[PDB]
Amino acid sequence: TVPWFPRTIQELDRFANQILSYGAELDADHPGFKDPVYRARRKQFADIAYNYRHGQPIPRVEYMEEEKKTWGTVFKTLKSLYKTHACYEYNHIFPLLEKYCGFHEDNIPQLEDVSQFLQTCTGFRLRPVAGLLSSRDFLGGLAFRVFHCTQYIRHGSKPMYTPEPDICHELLGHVPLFSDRSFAQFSQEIGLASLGAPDEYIEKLATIYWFTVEFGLCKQGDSIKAYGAGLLSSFGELQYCLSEKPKLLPLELEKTAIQNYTVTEFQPLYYVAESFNDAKEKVRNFAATIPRPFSVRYDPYTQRIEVLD
Ligand SMILES: Cc1ccnc(-n2c(S)nc3sc(C)c(C)c3c2=O)c1
Numbered sequence: 001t002v003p004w005f006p007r008t009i010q011e012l013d014r015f016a017n018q019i020l021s022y023g024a025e026l027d028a029d030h031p032g033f034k035d036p037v038y039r040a041r042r043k044q045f046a047d048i049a050y051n052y053r054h055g056q057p058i059p060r061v062e063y064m065e066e067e068k069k070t071w072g073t074v075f076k077t078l079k080s081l082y083k084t085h086a087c088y089e090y091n092h093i094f095p096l097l098e099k100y101c102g103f104h105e106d107n108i109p110q111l112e113d114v115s116q117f118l119q120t121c122t123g124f125r126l127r128p129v130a131g132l133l134s135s136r137d138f139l140g141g142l143a144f145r146v147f148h149c150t151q152y153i154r155h156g157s158k159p160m161y162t163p164e165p166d167i168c169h170e171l172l173g174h175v176p177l178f179s180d181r182s183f184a185q186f187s188q189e190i191g192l193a194s195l196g197a198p199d200e201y202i203e204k205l206a207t208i209y210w211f212t213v214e215f216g217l218c219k220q221g222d223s224i225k226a227y228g229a230g231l232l233s234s235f236g237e238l239q240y241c242l243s244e245k246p247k248l249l250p251l252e253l254e255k256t257a258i259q260n261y262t263v264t265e266f267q268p269l270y271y272v273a274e275s276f277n278d279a280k281e282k283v284r285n286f287a288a289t290i291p292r293p294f295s296v297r298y299d300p301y302t303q304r305i306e307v308l309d
């Protein structure tokens with residue numbers, strides 16, 4: 001009995017709120033655990049996501065001085081690496097994000113502005129998300145070029161640490177790659193692959209996602225550069241990923257899909273992509289191995305998924 005998936009973009013409304021209601025910020029472990037103001041702020045961002053419906057403007061939020069400071073620290077620290085460590089695509093778009101989107105140490109960009117910018121670049125759009133969605137639900141969004149995106153910021157006591165996605169990771173890690181057409185097509189391919197796929201393949205796709213969108217390296221002429229959002233938003237790991245320490249292997253999906261990984265330390269191993277067009281082709285070949293009694297394609301004119309046989 002084939003798993004349901006949205007067939008229109010508005011149908012992402014359906015399971016968008018089906019998050020893990022009891023989130024990371026509730027653990028005694030969390031940098032913000034003892035902070036009741038932080039607790040409430042987090043629920044505030046969650047209620048914004050909860051009430052969001054596809055098509056609406058994303059609500060603007062006045063960030064606090066404390067939050068802007070945390071952003072500032074993440075921004076300045078990370079900025080110092082991008083020219084040398086980040087891929088061309090990243091460095092190419094970053095100044096535009098500064099000019100048109102207010103990417104600056106003193107200013108946390110608003111999601112609506114960033115979403116409009118991306119729509120202009122590649123048709124990618126943002127949708128605020130409360131918390132952790134299933135891989136199935138999150139990856140499905142990508143098929144429509146929709147990135148489920150957090151709006152809250154990490155707790156101010158630890159600006160270099162987040163166990164979770166937060167706004168810094170989304171804007172400084174993901175957003176600049178979603179501005180590139182080739183990357184955008186690649187990421188969407190992973191989304192298309194996920195539609196109606198068995199649970200076992202959702203997990204293989206999530207693993208591929210992690211070794212690409214989150215922790216991917218790519219060839220850049222004779223050199224290698226970072227493009228994964230998890231690398232680009234981690235000061236420590238961004239420098240480490242391109243030192244002699246980690247092991248590097250070519251992106252190869254039948255191996256990548258089964259490779260184990262942990263979230264708590266630096267990756268002992270990275271996969272290197274030839275280019276985003278090549279990763280896309282590889283994902284397209286891999287999707288053909290997924291037992292699905294149909295074929296899918298996205299029609300951007302009507303914003304619907306076409307389902308054949
Ligand atoms: C597949 C999927 C579905 C929903 N969210 C995610 N997701 C994304 S996009 N970025 C990050 S950064 C970090 C430290 C974590 C844990 C995390 C994460 O979980 C991934």
Ligand SMILES: [Fe+3]
Nearest residue numbers: 165214229230
């Ligand atoms: Fe991420």
